[PDB]
Amino acid sequence: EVQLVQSGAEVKRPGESLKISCKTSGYSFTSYWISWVRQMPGKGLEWMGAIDPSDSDTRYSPSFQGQVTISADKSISTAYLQWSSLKASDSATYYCAKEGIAARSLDVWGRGVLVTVSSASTKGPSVFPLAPSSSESTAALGCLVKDYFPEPVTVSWNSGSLTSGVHTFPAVLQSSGLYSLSSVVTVPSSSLGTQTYVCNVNHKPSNTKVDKRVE
Amino acid sequence: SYELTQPPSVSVSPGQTARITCSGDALPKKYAYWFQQKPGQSPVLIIYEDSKRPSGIPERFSGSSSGTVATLTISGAQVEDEADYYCYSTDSSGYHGLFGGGTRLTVLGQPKAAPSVTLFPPSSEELQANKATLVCLISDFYPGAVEVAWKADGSAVNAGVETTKPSKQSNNKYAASSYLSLTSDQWKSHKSYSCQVTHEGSTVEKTVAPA
Numbered sequence A: 001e002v003q004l005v006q007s008g009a010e011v012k013r014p015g016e017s018l019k020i021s022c023k024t025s026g027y028s029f030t031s032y033w034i035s036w037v038r039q040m041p042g043k044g045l046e047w048m049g050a051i052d053p054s055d056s057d058t059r060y061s062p063s064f065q066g067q068v069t070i071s072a073d074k075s076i077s078t079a080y081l082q083w084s085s086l087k088a089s090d091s092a093t094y095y096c097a098k099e100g101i102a103a104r105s106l107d108v109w110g111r112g113v114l115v116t117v118s119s120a121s122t123k124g125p126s127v128f129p130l131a132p133s134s135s136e137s138t139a140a141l142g143c144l145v146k147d148y149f150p151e152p153v154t155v156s157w158n159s160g161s162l163t164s165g166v167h168t169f170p171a172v173l174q175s176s177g178l179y180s181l182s183s184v185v186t187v188p189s190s191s192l193g194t195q196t197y198v199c200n201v202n203h204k205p206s207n208t209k210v211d212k213r214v215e
Numbered sequence B: 001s002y003e004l005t006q007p008p009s010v011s012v013s014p015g016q017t018a019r020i021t022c023s024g025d026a027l028p029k030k031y032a033y034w035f036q037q038k039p040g041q042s043p044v045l046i047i048y049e050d051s052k053r054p055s056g057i058p059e060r061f062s063g064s065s066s067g068t069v070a071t072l073t074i075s076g077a078q079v080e081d082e083a084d085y086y087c088y089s090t091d092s093s094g095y096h097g098l099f100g101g102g103t104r105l106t107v108l109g110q111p112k113a114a115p116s117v118t119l120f121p122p123s124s125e126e127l128q129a130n131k132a133t134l135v136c137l138i139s140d141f142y143p144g145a146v147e148v149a150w151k152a153d154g155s156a157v158n159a160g161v162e163t164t165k166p167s168k169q170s171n172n173k174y175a176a177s178s179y180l181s182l183t184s185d186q187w188k189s190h191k192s193y194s195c196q197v198t199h200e201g202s203t204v205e206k207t208v209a210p211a
Helices: B124-128 B184-188
Strands: A003-006 A010-012 A018-025 A034-039 A045-052 A057-060 A069-073 A078-083 A092-099 A106-109 A113-117 A126-130 A138-148 A154-157 A166-168 A179-188 A197-203 A208-214 B009-012 B018-023 B033-037 B044-047 B061-066 B069-074 B083-090 B097-099 B103-107 B116-120 B131-141 B147-152 B161-163 B174-183 B193-199 B202-208
Touching (some): A010 A018, A034 A078, A045 B097, A126 A208, A126 B124, A138 A197, A138 B131, A179 A197, B069 B083, B147 B174
Parallel strands (some): A010 A113, B009 B103
Antiparallel strands (some): A003 A018, A034 A092, A045 A057, A092 A113, A126 A138, A197 A208, B116 B131, B161 B174, B193 B202
């Protein structure tokens, strides 16, 4: 079977260089063009360019020509896409694809590689309690998980012993480049005074976990 | 340059026929291709060479190209057909690939559901750091599209709002959140703030007041 194996996820800063790879097997590497396609978060697919490994011929979309370089190494059946100086807007999932017989037809796709380009530094979240203003049979409590980078964050309540009625929301990406999310749970007001409620917020990228008591 | 133009969104009820169009100057001379993309997955080829179906693609998908418009037709749409659909072709020379902007196909198949909205005031801990983040949490809405606006004492809030796109919940309804980032002084300068969530032509507003 045709297989395309792409390099792993990258987190880079604007102005840094980057080279990502696509190693193929199961067919004659130099007999087919390889296309590169990208997808910015929440946006559409974009054809970037293609290379013919038989003669190093390259074609580029006018939107990418001269700003990225596609290359190939037939000795290891690998295609590459590289930048000398990334832009922040280059955050995207990048796919390689073996072409079909017709020029620019797309035959077999790689699984894609996630590339994050951000000026934000790795930062654990500041966790703030969410409570209503001081009616009475239940109560909504929560935690604001503020200003962290990068993804992901996981949240539990009372070390995972409280799951019923928990709603943890996906993060917003702020213009600063930092993320924030919230988690909320509805609890009985009878328990408010005998039951403690703690949100456990884990941010492995910064090796930080916060257990915030919510009163 | 050259472009392929698609409608951003199409809605269909289950069992109905959906038609997704793709407009391009060179389509009278070039083949169109159709890709289906579901979240966290690579695109899947649905139609190639205007009208051909690959092995294993459901019979209900068909393609055609008339004039400058290629159409993907989904007869008797199913909920599992909910996805983004991209047309793909080349420029007139044939040397460069091009995608349409994509169409989000919504297959309804559950009743409309109004959002539940919870608005939290800032914590005292954040206020003691001279900051105030208002948190507007929105859940259990269907279909998955909302608009969020903020008001302060009835006046528009023109900056500081960050709102997520909707995300599918396990029950197949949708959730979103919106954040208004203020200073402590701004929070205390108004009598109230409101989060306004508009869904299917109607609005729910939640209000908080410095206490």
